[PDB]
Amino acid sequence: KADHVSTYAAFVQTHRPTGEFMFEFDEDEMFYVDLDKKETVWHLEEFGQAFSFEAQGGLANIAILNNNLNTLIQRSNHTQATNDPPEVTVFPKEPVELGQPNTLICHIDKFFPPVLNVTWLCNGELVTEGVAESLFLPRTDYSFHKFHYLTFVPSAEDFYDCRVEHWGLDQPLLKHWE
Amino acid sequence: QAFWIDLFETIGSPENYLFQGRQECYAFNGTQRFLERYIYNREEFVRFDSDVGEFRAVTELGRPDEEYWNSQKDILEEERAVPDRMCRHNYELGGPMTLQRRVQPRVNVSPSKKGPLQHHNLLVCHVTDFYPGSIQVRWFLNGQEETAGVVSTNLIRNGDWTFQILVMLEMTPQQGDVYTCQVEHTSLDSPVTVEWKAQ
Numbered sequence: 355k356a357d358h359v360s361t362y363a364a365f366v367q368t369h370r371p372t373g374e375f376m377f378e379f380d381e382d383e384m385f386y387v388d389l390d391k392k393e394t395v396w397h398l399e400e401f402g403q404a405f406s407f408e409a410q411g412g413l414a415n416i417a418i419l420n421n422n423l424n425t426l427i428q429r430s431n432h433t434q435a436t437n438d439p440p441e442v443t444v445f446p447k448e449p450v451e452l453g454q455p456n457t458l459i460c461h462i463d464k465f466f467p468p469v470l471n472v473t474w475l476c477n478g479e480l481v482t483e484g485v486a487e488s489l490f491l492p493r494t495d496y497s498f499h500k501f502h503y504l505t506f507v508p509s510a511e512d513f514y515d516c517r518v519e520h521w522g523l524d525q526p527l528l529k530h531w532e
Numbered sequence: 533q534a535f536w537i538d539l540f541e542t543i544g545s546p547e548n549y550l551f552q553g554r555q556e557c558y559a560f561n562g563t564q565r566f567l568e569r570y571i572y573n574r575e576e577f578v579r580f581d582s583d584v585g586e587f588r589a590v591t592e593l594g595r596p597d598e599e600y601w602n603s604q605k606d607i608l609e610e611e612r613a614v615p616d617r618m619c620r621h622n623y624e625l626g627g628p629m630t631l632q633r634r635v636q637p638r639v640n641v642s643p644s645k646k647g648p649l650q651h652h653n654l655l656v657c658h659v660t661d662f663y664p665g666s667i668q669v670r671w672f673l674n675g676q677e678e679t680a681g682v683v684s685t686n687l688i689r690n691g692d693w694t695f696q697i698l699v700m701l702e703m704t705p706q707q708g709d710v711y712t713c714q715v716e717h718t719s720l721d722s723p724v725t726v727e728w729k730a731q
């Protein structure tokens with residue numbers, strides 16, 4: 355029971371991403387520690403402008419968590435969790451108006467492990483530019499979700515696809531859009 | 533200007549194992565409740581709760597950790613300190629930046645399908661880009677509120693600190709009917725209305 359929920363959520367796993375550390379306020383990720391660049395990344399411009407964070411806290415918790423994983427792989431007689439396939443949804447950011455630039459959001463949800471491949475597709479071909487994406491967001495149910503974004507200009511002779519790959523998926527899921 | 537972090541305690545298809553650590557602060561009526569969650573794969577096995585005061589094996593896999601951690605006076609006092617320490621400081625950091633962050637909604641009223649003014653149709657009220665997510669959307673026909681026939685899709689989180697919702701009413705419109713969408717949000721002093729004429 356709370357007015358607001360402020361939380362640090364960090365994971366460590368065998369496959370890539372091998373580790374992740376972040377801070378979320380009311381289910382929205384505020385900041386994270388890039389473990390490779392060893393730098394704090396803020397979700398919004400105003401965040402990093404008013405606030406500071408020590409990346410050593412991020413990494414140190416990843417070190418503690420790495421140890422904890424080793425101890426539990428042992429304790430659990432090498433227990434590997436069952437692959438939870440994702441639930442994909444594609445929807446625009448703003449109401450669609452032909453010729454008016456918009457953003458296409460791809461919500462990959464309710465999966466485990468956070469090992470995934472996500473490619474945007476326009477008219478059958480891979481789109482690499484005007485592309486953004488979230489971290490492997492840790493759901494309260496110990497499952498994972500992710501957001502993918504594509505800046506697009508709505509046209510009638512166009513179709514969109516969010517192509518997802520997960521271990522609990524027999525064939526790569528294509529989730530189509532107008 | 534700087535955020536604080538407590539450090540987790542120490543334990544004691546392709547091959548893959550995961551460990552998850554969670555440091556949650558539950559802010560309610562000037563009070564902070566702290567929860568330190570230790571999860572192997574999807575199973576939370578051991579947890580510290582400021583309301584409990586000590587570590588508790590969530591499942592039998594956390595039994596050794598509950599037993600050991602609770603034996604160390606230092607670990608226990610360190611954890612107990614967290615609500616008034618890290619939980620409070622970080623809450624205090626978020627002033628009107630996160631605690632009082634307000635973004636006004638963009639309301640668009642449009643019919644679902646293009647056709648004549650007699651058949652069955654859905655009147656979509658697309659309320660987009662707002663924060664916080666707490667929002668009220670009411671439907672009005674000729675000044676009288678329509679309670680029944682409202683097909684809403686669960687509040688949508690865009691994952692960019694903005695939210696969206698689509699509230700559509702089932703309608704059989706007659707020529708000269710005025711359909712009104714009424715939005716109540718914390719980022720508005722007065723509610724925003726958008727009208728739709730039959731035509």
Ligand SMILES: *[C@@H]1O[C@H](CO)[C@@H](O)[C@H](O)[C@H]1NC(C)=O
Binds near residue numbers: 431
């Ligand atoms: C789990 O460990 C026990 C010994 O503690 C052993 O009897 C059991 O066979 C192990 N499980 C597997 C699948 O090897």
Ligand SMILES: *[C@@H]1O[C@H](CO)[C@@H](O)[C@H](O)[C@H]1NC(C)=O
Binds near residue numbers: 469470471519520521
């Ligand atoms: C992700 O993509 C790489 C290259 O396409 C591949 O080696 C890997 O197995 C993929 N796995 C999944 C299921 O995401």
